[PDB]
């Protein structure tokens with residue numbers, strides 16, 4: 193049953209993600225505008241050329257897949273939450289509703305944080321560091337810039353879900369707040385690994401690790417037992 197439940201809830205979540213991805217595909221040219229907007233306004237001297245051969249569809253498929261996941265985030269959050277509580281951990285179903293709503297708005301606040309705080313900051317640390325206008329002119333590849341935005345935006349959505357899945361595991365006594373306090377020296381490496389994968393330089397790898405450790409230290413404080 194628990195074996196089969198996942199092998200059906202997965203297919204429902206995967207079915208939702210593709211419906212969401214297809215929607216994202218249709219209005220992708222407009223989503224490409226929202227993404228281009230942060231650079232276009234801050235450093236207009238920086239040209240977004242397509243250094244790539246004939247790959248504006250790869251940029252499309254990346255856009256249709258990442259944005260298709262932010263559309264499906266409410267369905268995916270539900271399939272997680274229903275497979276765990278009241279299913280295994282909690283007991284009340286009107287503790288589940290404020291949990292789903294709370295976790296739906298934590299993925300949205302995560303994406304807004306990346307797009308409106310991490311990213312503009314990540315651009316000043318990259319090309320806004322004084323007179324670096326010479327090494328940044330038709331030097332920007334759109335496939336580079338778009339991807340970094342999509343990585344940063346999706347990672348922060350997910351990174352924000354940590355203090356709820358954690359508070360709920362700590363409450364269900366699956367983990368203790370001291371067990372997170374012991375994993376600190378490993379999450380510092382986790383955060384810098386994630387920061388190495390998604391960020392282009394050290395300045396941005398660090399810029400990313402900071403809110404991640406901060407989200408980890410929010411989970412320990414939600415060690416109210």
Ligand SMILES: CCCCCCCCCCC(CCCCCCCCCC)(CO[C@H]1O[C@@H](CO)[C@H](O[C@@H]2O[C@@H](CO)[C@H](O)[C@@H](O)[C@@H]2O)[C@@H](O)[C@@H]1O)CO[C@H]1O[C@@H](CO)[C@H](O[C@@H]2O[C@@H](CO)[C@H](O)[C@@H](O)[C@@H]2O)[C@@H](O)[C@H]1O
Nearest residue numbers: 212215216217218219220221222223225226259262263264
């Ligand atoms: C969960 C479902 C998914 C929801 C999110 C998906 C993405 C939604 C963004 C898409 C969308 C609304 C779509 C709504 C329908 C959703 C239905 C969902 C599926 C249901 C099953 C944004 O909608 C608006 O959003 C705001 C921008 O953020 C703005 O609104 C207000 O505006 C101010 C006005 O005065 C207000 O004063 C201000 O207050 C707000 O700024 C508008 O600028 C914008 O149109 C449409 O935008 C774009 O669509 C594309 C066609 O692909 C259009 O194609 C191009 O346009 C031609 C023009 O000639 C070009 O010639 C041609 O190149 C091409 O043809 C674009 O033109 C474009 O307009």
